[PDB]
Amino acid sequence: KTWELSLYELQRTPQEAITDGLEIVVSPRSLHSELMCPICLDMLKNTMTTKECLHRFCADCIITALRSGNKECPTCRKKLVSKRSLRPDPNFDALISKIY
């Protein structure tokens, strides 16, 4: 990846925050599959993220998978040397703790 910016991108301006009290309908989470872990199909909990490919799992599930001896990523099958190959992210955690 070059990270070349296009003509539009060189000129783009912010997308301002919606600050008026608007509520979001999140009654079902069959609209938000990005908050569910691919292994256990639950709300991601203590989210671990792979450095190289940015796939997210519960700490529980990804440690187990690595401990099984299988070094591939469960989502994209790209190699992982170890647990130094993933980082925790409190951002996703805190996001999920607000929605459910």
């Binding site: 003509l7 539009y8 509520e23 940015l54 996001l95």
Partner: protein, 97 residues
């Protein structure tokens, strides 16, 4: 069931433009995220994360950033009108140019 978007805002917003993530891009070292355009221009004059100050890469910062498909998916899904708005802005730009 219903959550105030003002409660989710802080997790959906780029610290470099103060608006919502557009083409969210994450730093591999610390995992902080930004708009593509904001972090790319920033990393032209710095090799340290805007938020936590950690070194992104020894020499070539762009090596340790990634497109965050998942994060951008959430933002578009949660922030109503956001996606339609960005697409429109781009449509309006190319018609002008």
């Amino acid at each position: 069931t219903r959550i105030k978007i003002t409660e989710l805002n802080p997790h959906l917003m780029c610290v470099l433009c103060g608006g919502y993530f557009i083409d969210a891009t994450t730093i591999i070292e610390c995992l902080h995220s930004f708009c593509k355009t904001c972090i790319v221009r920033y990393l032209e004059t710095s090799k340290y994360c805007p938020i936590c100050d950690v070194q992104v890469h020894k020499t070539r910062p762009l090596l340790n950033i990634r497109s965050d498909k998942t994060l951008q998916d959430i933002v578009y899904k949660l922030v109503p009108g956001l996606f339609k708005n960005e697409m429109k802005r781009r449509r309006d730009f190319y018609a002008a140019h």
